[PDB]
Structure 1
Amino acid sequence: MEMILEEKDASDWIYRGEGGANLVLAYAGSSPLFVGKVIRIQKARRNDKAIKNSNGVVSVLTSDEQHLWRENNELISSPNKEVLEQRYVQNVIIPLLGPKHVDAGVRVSVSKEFLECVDKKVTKQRPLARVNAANVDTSHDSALILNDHSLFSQGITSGGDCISVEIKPKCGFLPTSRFIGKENMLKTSVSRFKMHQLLKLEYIEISEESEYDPLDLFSGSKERVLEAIKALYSTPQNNFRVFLNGSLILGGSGESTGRTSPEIGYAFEDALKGFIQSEDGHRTECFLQLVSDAVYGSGVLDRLLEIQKLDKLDIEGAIHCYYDIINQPCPICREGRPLEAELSLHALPLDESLKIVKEYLIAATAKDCSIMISFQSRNAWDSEPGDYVSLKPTNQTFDYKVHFIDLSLKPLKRMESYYKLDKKIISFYNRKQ
């Protein structure tokens, strides 16, 4: 006993957003069971080689993956992808990031006709830019219900509007030189994000290089955190978005998003009215300081950075462990004269190779996730605040919550794509110098 979302329930859900794997819809009906929740629904994807097995079947886990993730029997026994992703979050990620900032959600049964109805709705409600993107996978029979982290609470409080900020921080550290070739040494001093911006700029996938440096955001320095926030505001690309009661008021158009112009900046400043009690023109600066204080105060990025640091070898190192795992002769090692560093990796007992690659894929989850920080203004006539920021410049107090979203299990075969991409980025960056 609980429930199934049917064709008749589709009308209660409205498009919120999407990424490469999922569609997200917000609840818009009346039931107290669902107010302030979102539903996450998996897209259909062929064209993705990493999720296929040797027979071209999209299996929950490949035999190689089952072997890699063997430590959690629960995980490898997942009968479908919805269960797999839920158990990965619950059993692998939550022990690392804690339950306070991670919602694994609740699985709900869905009918085929509910999903076909949603397919049609997202086609109508999508931005034009996304109309040909992959739609819902109507062969799945579960979906995931999660709290809406664009909201602090299910309903509006009298204090003000709920403003929520979403950050895709990317990788906050630089690899050591230990498994990196002499020709690729800039990797130890220039961030992956910065190097990638150069390639995106050459491929005209962005109108200009972002001002954002993840090394600032993860620096441990309040000034540098503020710098990162100001930068994200200026050039949001797909790294920064802001919601007013679950509605986009900054960013959200993919990495193609325009850099904040006077017009965009002006509308945003007015969108903050009431939320920040400051005169016209001054709220933006207060808002950026608030986000900065919440980010720094929460310490949430320190813990994420430690999981990102589970990438101990860099992909240039870990790819060798990958080949050992899948029991193939290593083509990296054929490319030229192998480092002693690399040979020692192949010398590793198979248990250590397994552990290294697993930890690399967990780190990839941490490098690719997002954080949603939701804020609720307090009335001066409320009692004392959980976590909060006090803005002296407006003498306002804001409760806040931080949640990690988009914490997905990365397919083992993606190690190959990760290697190729890294190779291309460093090759490109090197010749641009």
Structure 2
Amino acid sequence: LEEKDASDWIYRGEGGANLVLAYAGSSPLFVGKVIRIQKARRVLTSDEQHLWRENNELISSPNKEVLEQRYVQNVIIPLLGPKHVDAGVRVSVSKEFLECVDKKVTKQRPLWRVNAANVDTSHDSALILNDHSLFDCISVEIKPKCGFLPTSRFIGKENILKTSVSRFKMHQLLKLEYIEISEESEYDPLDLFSGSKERVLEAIKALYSTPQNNFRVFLNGSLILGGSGESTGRTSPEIGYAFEDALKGFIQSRTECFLQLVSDAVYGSGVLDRLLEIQKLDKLDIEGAIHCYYDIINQPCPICSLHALPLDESLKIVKEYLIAATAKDCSIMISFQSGDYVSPTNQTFDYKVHFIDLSLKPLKRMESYYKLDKKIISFYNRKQK
């Protein structure tokens, strides 16, 4: 892949860690593909090698692309089944390709995403996945987050709100406080993962209203609702109307029909149940896991029973924490086009559900995970009153 192929890629979005471009070309090699490119903010550490030592191919990975590839394949797939997970094929890229591509997209990237990161033009590799906004095609991206309450004996007396109130809902307050969002989200993950149909519908309405970085809709691969590479403001009446109009033809009628159809899809695919069992791989909560983290790296625990545990035990706990970290921050894409089908307008739609962004979380991140958790609850406690 060379500098001149850069033209054949168009901006599609990004998260904290990767840039994503869809193919606008004619090449059979790349039709229906997106290209996923790692960013450098501004291979495995010794402790990681040991943590994930159970998979040897995984920890001998030469670069980060093959790393995520094997992670998903060897650690995640066995857990979520391969029907909705794609580990993505690896492709070679040149420096001038990434540089040029990076030059190209800056214009459509959000400002604070540009301040924080660019493309890591030092990588000689990049991941090619299937464009899930392509089966007319209406795809929907959901970022569910953690859909459960912690229950740990390791959550302090001073933190009696963490077993009652979702981490999402507490985080909304902090986000708002640092001018990262404009108004509190109506979305509640507990509704989405509730495994009740009525309550999934509730969550999907809630997502439509205040989408933030949790909800997005694409027509033939182009954003029609939701922020581009970022969070977006509440859906205003102008937004409502233009999204409504973007629907014509697809929903024979429209917005409420669409949300019902999304709700029925999610629910009847039970794709969120399996995801939830993985998230729940966080059996102790950070307030528990962090102690094990300090044993692992053989550092005296600054935070101070959990320490009386065998290394292998401590290791599996921090391992599964990170694995749940991954499930807690992945996303789901559901493709729609007129056993996996959905049905007033009398239409029946086919649909496909995929997992995206199953990224391996850096072990070092256990420290800032604890720092942030600490910050979330102490800000939520203060507020009540």
Aligned to 1:56: none
Q: Give secondary structure in 2 for the equivalent of 1:131.
A: helix
Is the 1:237–1:254 contact (alpha carbons within 8 Å) kept by the matching residues of 2? no
Q: Give deviations 1:68-97, integer Å, cap 9, x for gaps.
A: 100000111001111111100100011111
The alpha-carbon distance between structure 1 residues 113 and 169, as it changes in their structure 2 partners (threshold 3 A), is same
- Deviation at residue 256 of structure 1 after TM alignment: 4.4
Distance 1:254 1:16 in 2: 8
3-state secondary structure, aligned to 1:44:
strand
By how many angstroms is 1:306 displaced? 0.1
Task: State the partner residue of 2:198.
Answer: 223
Report if the CA contact (8 A) 1:207-1:258 is conserved. Answer: yes
Q: 1:217 touches 1:228 (CA, 8 Å); kept in 2?
A: yes
Between 1:286-295 and 1:171-180, the stretch displaced more is 171-180
Contact 1:207 1:256 in 2 (8 A): no
CA distance in 1, matches of 2:307, 2:63: 33
1:129 is displaced (CA, Å) by: 6.1
Residues 254 and 39 (structure 1 numbering): CA distance in 2 closer, same or farther, change over 3 Å? closer
1:143, 1:74 → 2: CA distance?
19
Residue 11 of structure 2 aligns to a residue in which SS?
strand
- Closer/same/farther in 2, CA of residues 314 and 6 from structure 1, 3 Å limit: same
Note the C-alpha offset of 1:10: 1.1
Q: Deviations over 1:3-36 (max 9, x none)?
A: xx11121111111111111111000110112111
Per-residue CA deviations over 1:324-383 (Å, capped at 9, x if unaligned) read 0000110000xxxxxxxxxx110011100000000000000000110011101xxxxxxx
- State the 1:252 CA deviation: 1.5
Question: Is the alpha carbon distance of 1:256 and 1:125 closer, same or farther for their aligned partners in structure 2, counting shifts above 3 Å?
Answer: closer
- Sequence identity (%): 99
SS at 2:22's partner residue?
strand
1:21 to 17, 20, 34: 17
Match of 2:144 in 1: 169
Match of 1:138 among 95, 115, 121: 121
1:213 and 2:213 are equivalent in the alignment? no
CA separation in 1, counterparts of 2:316 and 2:275? 19
**Higher mean displacement: 199-208 or 182-191:** 199-208
- Render the CA deviation track for 1:240-296: whole Å, top value 9, x for unaligned: 111010000001246641101110000000001111001xxxx00000000000000
Unaligned runs of 5+ in 1: 47-59, 153-160, 334-343, 377-385
Q: Secondary structure at the match of 2:333?
A: strand
Worse-matched range after superposition: 202-211 or 32-41: 202-211
Distance 1:125 1:261, change over 3 A: closer
**Alpha-carbon distance change, 186 to 255 in structure 1, aligned in 2, over 3 angstroms:** farther
TM-score for the superposition, normalised by structure 2: 0.97
Contact 1:164 1:372 (C-alpha < 8 Å) held by counterparts: yes
Question: Residues of 2 paired with 1:254 and 1:142: CA distance?
Answer: 22
Residue pair 1:12, 1:29 contacting (<8 A) in 2 also: yes
- Partners of 1:26 and 1:424 in 2: CA distance: 37
8 A Cα contact 1:177 1:185, kept in partner: no
The answer for the alignment partner of 2:360 in structure 1 is: 409
* CA drift at 1:133: 4.5
Distance apart, 1:112 and its partner CA: 1.4
Aligned residues: 383
Alpha-carbon distance change, 352 to 130 in structure 1, aligned in 2, over 3 angstroms: closer
1:290-333, Cα deviation, whole Å (9 max, x unpaired) = 00000001100000000000000000000000000000110000
Superimposed CA distance per residue, residues 95-142 of structure 1 (whole angstroms, 9 cap, x where no aligned partner): 111111111010001111211211111124435664444221111101
Distance 2:313 2:256 in 1: 49
What residue number does 1:261 align with?
A: 236
Gaps of 5+ in 2: none
C-alpha RMSD over aligned residues? 1.2
Change beyond 3 A, Cα 1:33–1:267? same
CA contact (8 A) 1:22 1:41 kept: yes
2:69 and 2:156 map into 1 onto residues whose CA distance is: 38
Q: Partners in 2 of 1:186 and 1:346 — Cα distance?
A: 26
1:256–1:10 CA distance, 2 compared to 1 (3 A):
closer
Residues 116 and 367 of structure 1, relative CA distance in 2, 3 Å threshold: same
- Cα contact 1:206–1:255 (8 A) shared by 2: no
For the residues of structure 1 that align with 2:231 and 2:4, how far apart are their CA atoms? 36
Q: 3-state DSSP class of the match of 1:42? A: strand
| Cα offsets for 1:118-172 (capped at 9, x unmatched) | 11111244356644442211111010000001111xxxxxxxx201100110000
Structure 2 Cα separation of the partners of residues 264 and 98 of structure 1: 37
Q: How does 1:173-322 map to 2 (within 5 A)?
A: 173-253=148-228, 256-278=231-253, 283-322=254-293
Change (3 A) 1:62 1:238: same
| Partners of 2:109 and 2:229 within 8 A in 1 | no
SS in 1 for 2:117: coil
Change (3 A) 1:255 1:148: closer
**Structure 1 CA distance for aligned equivalents of residues 185 and 103 of structure 2:** 35
1:195–1:425: 8 Å Cα contact kept in structure 2? yes
* 3-state SS of paired residue (1:400): strand
Q: Which SS does the other structure have where 1:194 is aligned?
A: helix
In 1, Cα distance between equivalents of 2:179 and 2:125: 39
CA distance in 2, matches of 1:407, 1:256: 20
- Whether the 8 Å contact between 2:218 and 2:224 is mirrored in structure 1 is yes
Distance in 1, matches of 2:179 and 2:126, equals 36
CA contact (8 A) 1:241 1:252 kept: yes
Choose 1 or 2 for highest CA Rg.
Answer: 1
